[PDB]
């Protein structure tokens, strides 16, 4: 091609509402802020997703619950991430929780729980936990260990 022929698509660099500026540019004089009082002021208003005009807000009248944590903070307990059967179909191999993260499921500092949705496969499946359903579904076609170490 040629630098003269390049150009973007009809969407794509829309560009741009700025006024300001003319009468019957639309948008002149009050610059769309509409006359007024506070909202049209430079600092504008008070943060609408919260402020209610001085009555007590709609949040903050709801009660709260239950455990919010105390000071040394979050407690250290092993987290599990469930992955499905339907999800792990494509793997013909060993299927270790190690391998699984490499796929783009199983995250990192999470233990493995395979579960539920999908049909099993005659696969070795290494993991930390199995649901009621997934253990069975599996036990029909293939077979699997449970992982505990360290």
């Amino acid at each position: 091609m040629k630098l003269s022929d390049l150009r973007p698509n009809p969407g794509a660099n829309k560009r741009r509402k700025r006024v300001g500026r003319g009468p019957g540019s639309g948008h002149g004089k009050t610059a769309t802020r509409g006359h007024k009082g506070q909202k049209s002021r430079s600092g504008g208003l008070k943060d609408p997703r919260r402020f209610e005009g001085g009555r007590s807000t709609t949040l903050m009248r709801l009660p709260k619950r239950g455990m919010q944590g105390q000071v040394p903070g979050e407690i250290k307990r092993p987290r599990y991430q469930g992955v499905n059967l339907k999800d792990l179909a494509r793997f013909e191999g060993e299927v270790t929780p190690e391998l699984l993260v490499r796929a783009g499921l199983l995250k990192k500092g999470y233990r493995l729980k395979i579960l539920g949705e999908g049909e099993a496969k005659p696969l070795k499946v290494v993991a930390h936990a199995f649901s009621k359903s997934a253990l069975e579904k599996l036990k029909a076609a293939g077979g699997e260990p449970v992982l505990l170490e360290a």
Binding site: P48, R49, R50, T58, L59, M60, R61, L62, P63, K64, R65, Q68
Partner: protein, 62 residues
């Protein structure tokens, strides 16, 4: 900078996956009350906005 996620929005509500918000119901000191007041007593699906406010107040990620 990074938005700050308001704490107690977070302590009073939950965004029910897909897509909206759910709070408890409202009464905490009462003798003569029907025994509904064990009704509700349960969680309440807030109206709207009230949910778009909230929501936008706690983000990244909920």
């Amino acid at each position: 900078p990074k938005m700050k996620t308001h704490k107690g929005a977070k302590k009073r509500v939950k965004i029910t996956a897909s897509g909206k918000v759910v709070a408890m119901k409202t009464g905490k000191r009462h003798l003569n009350w029907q025994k509904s007041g064990k009704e509700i007593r349960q969680k309440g699906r807030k109206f709207v906005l009230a949910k778009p406010e909230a929501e936008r107040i706690k983000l990244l990620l909920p």
